[PDB]
Amino acid sequence: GAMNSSNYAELFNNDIKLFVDDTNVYRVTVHKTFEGNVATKAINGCIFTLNPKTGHLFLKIIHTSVWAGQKRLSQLAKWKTAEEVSALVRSLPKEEQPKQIIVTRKAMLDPLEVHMLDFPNIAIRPTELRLPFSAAMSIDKLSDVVMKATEPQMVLFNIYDDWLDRISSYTAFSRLTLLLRALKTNEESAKMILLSDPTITIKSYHLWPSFTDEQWITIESQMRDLILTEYGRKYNV
Amino acid sequence: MNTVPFTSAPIEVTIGIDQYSFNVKENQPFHGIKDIPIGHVHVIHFQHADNSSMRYGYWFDCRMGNFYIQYDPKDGLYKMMEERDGAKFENIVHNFKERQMMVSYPKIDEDDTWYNLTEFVQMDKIRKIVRKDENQFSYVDSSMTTVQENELSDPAHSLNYTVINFKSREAIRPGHEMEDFLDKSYYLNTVMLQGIFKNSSNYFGELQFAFLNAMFFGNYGSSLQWHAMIELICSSATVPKHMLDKLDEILYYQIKTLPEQYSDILLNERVWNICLYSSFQKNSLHNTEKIMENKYPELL
Numbered sequence: 001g002a003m004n005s006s007n008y009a010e011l012f013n014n015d016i017k018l019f020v021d022d023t024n025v026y027r028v029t030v031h032k033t034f035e036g037n038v039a040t041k042a043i044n045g046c047i048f049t050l051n052p053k054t055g056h057l058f059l060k061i062i063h064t065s066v067w068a069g070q071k072r073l074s075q076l077a078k079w080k081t082a083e084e085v086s087a088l089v090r091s092l093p094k095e096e097q098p099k100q101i102i103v104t105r106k107a108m109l110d111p112l113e114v115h116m117l118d119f120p121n122i123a124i125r126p127t128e129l130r131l132p133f134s135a136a137m138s139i140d141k142l143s144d145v146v147m148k149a150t151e152p153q154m155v156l157f158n159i160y161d162d163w164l165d166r167i168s169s170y171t172a173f174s175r176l177t178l179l180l181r182a183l184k185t186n187e188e189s190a191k192m193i194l195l196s197d198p199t200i201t202i203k204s205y206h207l208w209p210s211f212t213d214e215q216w217i218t219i220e221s222q223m224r225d226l227i228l229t230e231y232g233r234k235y236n237v
Numbered sequence: 238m239n240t241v242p243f244t245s246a247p248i249e250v251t252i253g254i255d256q257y258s259f260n261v262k263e264n265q266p267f268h269g270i271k272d273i274p275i276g277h278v279h280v281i282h283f284q285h286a287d288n289s290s291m292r293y294g295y296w297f298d299c300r301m302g303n304f305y306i307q308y309d310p311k312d313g314l315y316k317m318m319e320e321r322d323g324a325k326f327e328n329i330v331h332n333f334k335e336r337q338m339m340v341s342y343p344k345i346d347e348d349d350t351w352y353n354l355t356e357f358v359q360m361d362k363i364r365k366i367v368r369k370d371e372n373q374f375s376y377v378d379s380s381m382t383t384v385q386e387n388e389l390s391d392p393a394h395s396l397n398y399t400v401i402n403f404k405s406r407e408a409i410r411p412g413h414e415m416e417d418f419l420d421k422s423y424y425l426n427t428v429m430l431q432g433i434f435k436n437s438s439n440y441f442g443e444l445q446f447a448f449l450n451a452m453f454f455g456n457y458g459s460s461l462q463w464h465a466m467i468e469l470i471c472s473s474a475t476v477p478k479h480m481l482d483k484l485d486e487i488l489y490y491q492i493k494t495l496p497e498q499y500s501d502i503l504l505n506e507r508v509w510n511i512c513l514y515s516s517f518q519k520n521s522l523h524n525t526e527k528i529m530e531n532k533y534p535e536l537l
């Protein structure tokens with residue numbers, strides 16, 4: 001059924017699973033037309049498909065050409081997401097295919113269920129967690145490859161860099177969700193925290209800076225602080 | 238005009254004949270129903286006075302044989318039986334008619350309600366759903382499960398309705414996933430109409446059969462089947478115009494006949510609001526929407 005705080009360690013067991021977030025598949029800018037009406041212009045998007053145990057990210061880039069001449073794009077986007085996840089699964093060897101796929105929004109359940117009818121043994125599940133994967137496009141390297149794509153493309157990342165060499169997947173997911181939650185609540189302050197110090201760099205093959213264990217404690221502390229100052233300002237605390 | 242004689246009425250029972258019902262007292266001198274119109278299929282149903290659980294009854298066509306009802310004190314129910322000795326049967330019926338021990342199927346000038354409810358119900362078609370080959374009539378009760386319910390446990394006692402499942406490979410062409418899920422015309426017109434039913438007459442018959450079983454016996458499996466068959470048509474963008482017009486008439490008479498006190502449970506709020514107000518056919522069921530809105534505006 002639905003995934004929540006009570007069955008949260010199941011993410012880190014040895015059953016292969018993937019989160020699918022569709023919140024950046026269909027992206028637009030709204031603008032005024034010469035006649036003073038409003039129009040949208042689509043920009044490149046992405047499906048965010050993540051293995052929470054390994055950190056393996058299957059970033060499928062959604063090029064704007066996929067919307068040309070199509071109607072009802074927000075509905076189509078959900079079905080296009082499910083089409084692309086189904087294609088990914090089928091491209092994997094059987095022993096790499098997920099046992100479960102967790103969608104971050106319940107409107108993805110029926111489209112994904114229908115596209116995966118050929119896979120009756122794969123469970124399609126929702127979640128009550130309010131996960132901050134929409135902020136994936138606040139990661140500079142992910143935003144860059146999406147916005148430069150001129151055609152449909154799948155790019156593979158490890159969203160944990162080398163963290164699993166030093167911490168568990170439970171701890172690595174916690175750090176990821178904290179970083180993304182901060183980026184979502186105030187992106188500028190979040191990025192200032194991460195990039196203020198010019199002597200901590202991001203390796204060419206990584207997404208985040210090469211923080212020592214101690215610096216990560218400092219960083220993580222600064223992200224919590226940021227999330228509370230705005231959570232309390234929300235309801236004036 | 239045909240006759241369903243009764244051996245006796247040893248237990249107090251509410252007896253149902255199509256949309257009519259009457260009470261018989263324990264050991265009352267009751268010997269059946271006469272003047273049953275020939276040319277229509279019928280249902281005789283039962284509700285014991287001592288146990289409201291297990292409404293049960295028999296679907297039958299008087300043109301297919303001489304049938305009587307006799308109470309079995311071992312199995313504890315009124316059973317339908319076939320008398321093959323036509324002379325003995327003629328001899329018995331005439332005795333009961335002379336002593337005026339039979340109630341009469343009513344014959345009013347202003348009525349076509351049973352015909353409108355059973356237009357596509359056939360006895361031979363009924364036997365494809367309710368399997369009991371050695372009898373010409375078909376037994377149904379409240380508790381009988383459907384083949385699909387048995388997929389979600391005695392197969393001999395099941396209702397073999399046509400399985401309808403909108404998230405199934407039968408329903409969804411590979412590569413047409415969003416198209417076929419959002420517009421069920423493929424499933425209706427090709428899978429079901431052209432490859433299972435053969436014609437709309439047959440689609441309407443199973444739907445009619447499903448509603449009556451749900452209404453007369455409180456068979457949950459029948460109710461599910463009736464709503465599924467309505468939803469498939471209403472969720473299809475491409476439906477022949479004659480089918481929509483007949484569906485409107487069919488549903489109108491089902492809603493008109495439904496006991497007001499069982500609407501709350503007999504009608505699925507989600508299916509009906511979807512069908513009348515959201516679906517492709519939201520504008521195509523004028524008579525049904527009018528009676529629903531004037532009779533059960535709470536469900537909507």
Ligand SMILES: O=C(NCCO)c1ccc(Cl)cc1
Pocket residue numbers: 242243244305307320326329330
């Ligand atoms: O034969 C009859 N009953 C005993 C057999 O169990 C019988 C047959 C037909 C009618 Cl109408 C009534 C009784």
Ligand SMILES: O=C(NCCO)c1ccc(Cl)cc1
Pocket residue numbers: 254257258259260270340341342343
């Ligand atoms: O309607 C009947 N009884 C009175 C109800 O108020 C009734 C119905 C059908 C037959 Cl066949 C006989 C009596």
Ligand SMILES: O=C(NCCO)c1ccc(Cl)cc1
Pocket residue numbers: 357358359362363365366399433434439440442443446
């Ligand atoms: O044709 C029917 N459907 C089943 C085909 O397998 C049908 C027709 C009429 C009735 Cl009453 C019941 C079923």
Ligand SMILES: O=C(NCCO)c1ccc(Cl)cc1
Pocket residue numbers: 451452454455456457460502503
């Ligand atoms: O849902 C039903 N009953 C209420 C739960 O007790 C139900 C619906 C339709 C039929 Cl025909 C029977 C039961």
